[PDB]
Every structure is written in C-alpha cells, then in structure tokens.
RNA sequence: UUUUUUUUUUUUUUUUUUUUUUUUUUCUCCUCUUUUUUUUUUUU
C-alpha cells in the first residue's frame, strides 16, 4: 500500500543498517517509480558529519 | 506494471619571373577683262 510500502522500506532498511551490510543496491525495474521510491522516504541520514 | 544501446563540424602551406607613346591608304583638279605697273614733295 501507499503507506504500507513505506513500512517495507523502513523494515528492510532497519534490520540491515545495524549490521555491516549497509551499502545496498536496489534493482528497481522502472525509470519512473525509481525516483518515487527515494522521494517518499525523506529521512535516512546515513552519513557521518565528517564524510 | 514499459528496461538497454546506436562516434563527429577536410588534412596542408616557409611560390621564381629580367618591359614602355603609337600601330595600317583614297586620284587628277580653267582664279573673267582701263593699263603701262604708280612713285618727288610737305605736314605723324
């Protein structure tokens, strides 16, 4: 769902950032919805202030 | 619920020269009447 797919995004990006496999590649199969995935999350901040 | 790939505006430049206005035709051709020829001279 529109508000439940975000739940999937914040589920997979939760049980994987704790461990060492934080670099992740998502193979979206559409040029259109690829930007839609990133647009509707808006909060990951997975960067240190030095980098 | 619609991915991936399909080049672009020709290359070249560091060659010598010792002439001179023009330019080229037109043929022979009946002259009518007072004359010898007047004349110095002086006033500029």
PDB file of C-alpha atoms (C1' of nucleotides) in Angstrom:
ATOM      1  CA  UNK A   1       0.000   0.000   0.000  1.00  0.00           C
ATOM      2  CA  UNK A   2       0.955   3.671  -0.329  1.00  0.00           C
ATOM      3  CA  UNK A   3       1.535   3.904   3.434  1.00  0.00           C
ATOM      4  CA  UNK A   4       2.445   0.202   3.756  1.00  0.00           C
ATOM      5  CA  UNK A   5       5.183   0.063   1.112  1.00  0.00           C
ATOM      6  CA  UNK A   6       6.917   2.725   3.201  1.00  0.00           C
ATOM      7  CA  UNK A   7       6.664   0.217   6.046  1.00  0.00           C
ATOM      8  CA  UNK A   8       8.521  -2.318   3.899  1.00  0.00           C
ATOM      9  CA  UNK A   9      11.151   0.313   3.084  1.00  0.00           C
ATOM     10  CA  UNK A  10      11.645   1.163   6.758  1.00  0.00           C
ATOM     11  CA  UNK A  11      11.680  -2.544   7.636  1.00  0.00           C
ATOM     12  CA  UNK A  12      14.382  -3.694   5.216  1.00  0.00           C
ATOM     13  CA  UNK A  13      16.420  -0.545   5.928  1.00  0.00           C
ATOM     14  CA  UNK A  14      16.212  -1.350   9.664  1.00  0.00           C
ATOM     15  CA  UNK A  15      17.382  -4.964  10.042  1.00  0.00           C
ATOM     16  CA  UNK A  16      20.331  -4.263   7.716  1.00  0.00           C
ATOM     17  CA  UNK A  17      21.785  -0.927   8.889  1.00  0.00           C
ATOM     18  CA  UNK A  18      22.575  -2.446  12.294  1.00  0.00           C
ATOM     19  CA  UNK A  19      24.899  -4.991  10.674  1.00  0.00           C
ATOM     20  CA  UNK A  20      27.828  -4.300   8.356  1.00  0.00           C
ATOM     21  CA  UNK A  21      25.898  -4.636   5.070  1.00  0.00           C
ATOM     22  CA  UNK A  22      24.660  -1.041   4.998  1.00  0.00           C
ATOM     23  CA  UNK A  23      25.815  -0.449   1.385  1.00  0.00           C
ATOM     24  CA  UNK A  24      22.803  -1.771  -0.519  1.00  0.00           C
ATOM     25  CA  UNK A  25      21.740  -1.613  -4.173  1.00  0.00           C
ATOM     26  CA  UNK A  26      18.042  -1.763  -5.092  1.00  0.00           C
ATOM     27  CA  UNK A  27      17.289  -3.013  -8.603  1.00  0.00           C
ATOM     28  CA  UNK A  28      14.132  -1.069  -9.377  1.00  0.00           C
ATOM     29  CA  UNK A  29      12.683  -2.124 -12.737  1.00  0.00           C
ATOM     30  CA  UNK A  30      11.137   1.219 -13.720  1.00  0.00           C
ATOM     31  CA  UNK A  31      12.772   4.550 -14.522  1.00  0.00           C
ATOM     32  CA  UNK A  32       9.672   6.352 -13.242  1.00  0.00           C
ATOM     33  CA  UNK A  33       9.000   4.772  -9.853  1.00  0.00           C
ATOM     34  CA  UNK A  34      12.732   4.661  -9.095  1.00  0.00           C
ATOM     35  CA  UNK A  35      12.565   8.347  -8.190  1.00  0.00           C
ATOM     36  CA  UNK A  36       9.233   7.712  -6.463  1.00  0.00           C
ATOM     37  CA  UNK A  37      10.915   5.326  -4.021  1.00  0.00           C
ATOM     38  CA  UNK A  38      13.502   7.882  -2.897  1.00  0.00           C
ATOM     39  CA  UNK A  39      11.032  10.788  -2.932  1.00  0.00           C
ATOM     40  CA  UNK A  40       8.638   9.287  -0.386  1.00  0.00           C
ATOM     41  CA  UNK A  41      11.042   8.396   2.438  1.00  0.00           C
ATOM     42  CA  UNK A  42      12.869  11.709   3.074  1.00  0.00           C
ATOM     43  CA  UNK A  43      14.684  10.520   6.241  1.00  0.00           C
ATOM     44  CA  UNK A  44      17.651   8.173   6.301  1.00  0.00           C
ATOM     45  CA  UNK A  45      20.599  10.476   7.242  1.00  0.00           C
ATOM     46  CA  UNK A  46      23.032   7.551   6.900  1.00  0.00           C
ATOM     47  CA  UNK A  47      26.102   9.775   6.806  1.00  0.00           C
ATOM     48  CA  UNK A  48      28.624  10.967   9.384  1.00  0.00           C
ATOM     49  CA  UNK A  49      29.323  14.684   9.723  1.00  0.00           C
ATOM     50  CA  UNK A  50      33.000  14.184   8.776  1.00  0.00           C
ATOM     51  CA  UNK A  51      32.224  12.481   5.451  1.00  0.00           C
TER      52      UNK A  51
ATOM     53  C1'   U B   1       3.371  -2.734 -14.113  1.00  0.00           C
ATOM     54  C1'   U B   2       7.069  -0.202 -20.189  1.00  0.00           C
ATOM     55  C1'   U B   3      14.156  -1.715 -19.407  1.00  0.00           C
ATOM     56  C1'   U B   4      19.253  -1.453 -22.783  1.00  0.00           C
ATOM     57  C1'   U B   5      22.144   0.760 -26.907  1.00  0.00           C
ATOM     58  C1'   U B   6      23.065   3.300 -31.628  1.00  0.00           C
ATOM     59  C1'   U B   7      31.318   8.189 -32.546  1.00  0.00           C
ATOM     60  C1'   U B   8      31.957  13.549 -35.125  1.00  0.00           C
ATOM     61  C1'   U B   9      31.966  20.362 -37.607  1.00  0.00           C
ATOM     62  C1'   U B  10      38.717  18.451 -44.892  1.00  0.00           C
ATOM     63  C1'   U B  11      44.195  17.293 -43.942  1.00  0.00           C
ATOM     64  C1'   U B  12      48.090  21.117 -45.981  1.00  0.00           C
ATOM     65  C1'   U B  13      51.266  25.732 -46.701  1.00  0.00           C
ATOM     66  C1'   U B  14      58.057  28.860 -45.300  1.00  0.00           C
ATOM     67  C1'   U B  15      55.994  30.232 -54.532  1.00  0.00           C
ATOM     68  C1'   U B  16      60.638  32.141 -59.131  1.00  0.00           C
ATOM     69  C1'   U B  17      59.537  35.805 -63.105  1.00  0.00           C
ATOM     70  C1'   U B  18      64.936  40.281 -66.424  1.00  0.00           C
ATOM     71  C1'   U B  19      59.123  45.685 -70.098  1.00  0.00           C
ATOM     72  C1'   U B  20      57.492  51.034 -72.371  1.00  0.00           C
ATOM     73  C1'   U B  21      53.790  56.606 -76.593  1.00  0.00           C
ATOM     74  C1'   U B  22      51.966  54.917 -81.402  1.00  0.00           C
ATOM     75  C1'   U B  23      50.386  50.753 -84.532  1.00  0.00           C
ATOM     76  C1'   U B  24      47.513  50.464 -91.194  1.00  0.00           C
ATOM     77  C1'   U B  25      45.791  54.113 -97.655  1.00  0.00           C
ATOM     78  C1'   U B  26      41.934  57.255-101.239  1.00  0.00           C
ATOM     79  C1'   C B  27      43.152  60.085-107.518  1.00  0.00           C
ATOM     80  C1'   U B  28      43.694  64.109-111.344  1.00  0.00           C
ATOM     81  C1'   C B  29      41.670  69.272-110.323  1.00  0.00           C
ATOM     82  C1'   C B  30      40.039  76.519-116.466  1.00  0.00           C
ATOM     83  C1'   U B  31      41.214  82.113-110.390  1.00  0.00           C
ATOM     84  C1'   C B  32      36.901  86.632-116.231  1.00  0.00           C
ATOM     85  C1'   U B  33      38.755  91.976-118.716  1.00  0.00           C
ATOM     86  C1'   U B  34      41.102 100.559-118.448  1.00  0.00           C
ATOM     87  C1'   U B  35      46.609  99.667-118.286  1.00  0.00           C
ATOM     88  C1'   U B  36      51.682 100.653-118.610  1.00  0.00           C
ATOM     89  C1'   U B  37      52.755  98.886-113.267  1.00  0.00           C
ATOM     90  C1'   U B  38      52.035 104.457-109.688  1.00  0.00           C
ATOM     91  C1'   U B  39      56.429 106.551-107.174  1.00  0.00           C
ATOM     92  C1'   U B  40      59.397 113.834-105.884  1.00  0.00           C
ATOM     93  C1'   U B  41      57.075 116.874-102.270  1.00  0.00           C
ATOM     94  C1'   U B  42      55.288 118.569 -97.074  1.00  0.00           C
ATOM     95  C1'   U B  43      52.617 118.432 -92.646  1.00  0.00           C
ATOM     96  C1'   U B  44      52.524 111.976 -87.687  1.00  0.00           C
TER      97        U B  44
END
